[PDB]
């Protein structure tokens, strides 16, 4: 669950932050824990200083949150970060890491989506599947 | 030369063609 009462990193503000679509369509949240107070670069442009302990941040896009996660992973060795999706109705959807284990590591219970049982050169030509709802993969 | 009545007749035929074109466009649009 997303604790809304987590304090935010000390930032002086910028023009690069989230627009009206964040409060109207969807917004993203990233939390992480730091061992010390240290300066990081905002993914929207500018420098902010994260506090010692937990940090909660709001963004407009998932890619901005994951860019910040990659930055703090390769520059501060922080891997406990969690990314959530928040709707205007208040429903919070946990996004990353989805099952608690990072996607580059195999975890039990994961099912393959979009896997094709042949090589890419065995896809069908369009002329078989014109005027037909058969997929080009077979 | 051409008179006013002839131009009016051409305008009436063009309006008929406009109605037929609108009908064809509605038929093509399903």
């Amino acid at each position: 669950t997303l604790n809304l009462q987590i304090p935010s990193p000390t930032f002086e503000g910028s023009t690069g932050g989230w627009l009206r679509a964040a409060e109207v369509e969807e917004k993203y949240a990233i939390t992480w824990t730091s061992p010390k107070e240290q300066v990081f670069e905002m993914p929207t442009g500018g420098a902010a200083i994260m506090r010692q302990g937990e940090n909660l941040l709001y963004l407009a896009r998932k890619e901005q949150c994951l860019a910040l996660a990659t930055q703090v992973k390769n520059s501060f060795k922080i891997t406990d970060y969690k990314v959530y999706r928040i709707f205007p109705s208040g429903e919070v959807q946990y996004l990353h890491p989805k099952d608690g284990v990072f996607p580059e590591k195999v975890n039990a219970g994961r099912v393959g989506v979009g896997n094709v049982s042949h090589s890419i050169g065995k896809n069908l030509n369009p002329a078989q599947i014109k005027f037909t709802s058969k997929s080009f993969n077979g | 030369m051409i008179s006013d009545t002839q131009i009016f007749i051409a305008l009436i035929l063009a309006l008929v063609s406009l109605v037929l074109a609108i009908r064809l466009g509605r038929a093509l649009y399903q």
Binding site: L19, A21, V83, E104, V111, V116 | -
Partner: protein, 80 residues
């Protein structure tokens, strides 16, 4: 949303998952390769179409393939 497919030429090197900026791919258990794992795309609604995964794939002609389709707010990379 874009469509991401993983073909059975995948060797399970996990490079495409590490290259993904939008957390679209993940590694699942498999028996078709020596690494014992294959890439999968359960989250293609967040796929922007950047094809960093296709750049990262080391198998001769790519095992992971991105087909651009219907554009959404997430796929267009719109912060507005």
């Amino acid at each position: 949303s874009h469509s991401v497919k993983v073909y059975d030429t995948c060797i399970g090197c996990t490079q495409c998952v590490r290259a993904c900026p939008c957390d679209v791919l993940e590694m699942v258990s498999w028996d078709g390769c020596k690494a014992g794992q294959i890439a999968s795309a359960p989250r293609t609604e967040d796929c922007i179409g950047c094809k960093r995964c296709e750049t990262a794939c080391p198998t001769d002609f790519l095992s992971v393939r991105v087909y651009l389709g219907g554009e959404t707010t997430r796929s267009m990379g719109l912060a507005y």
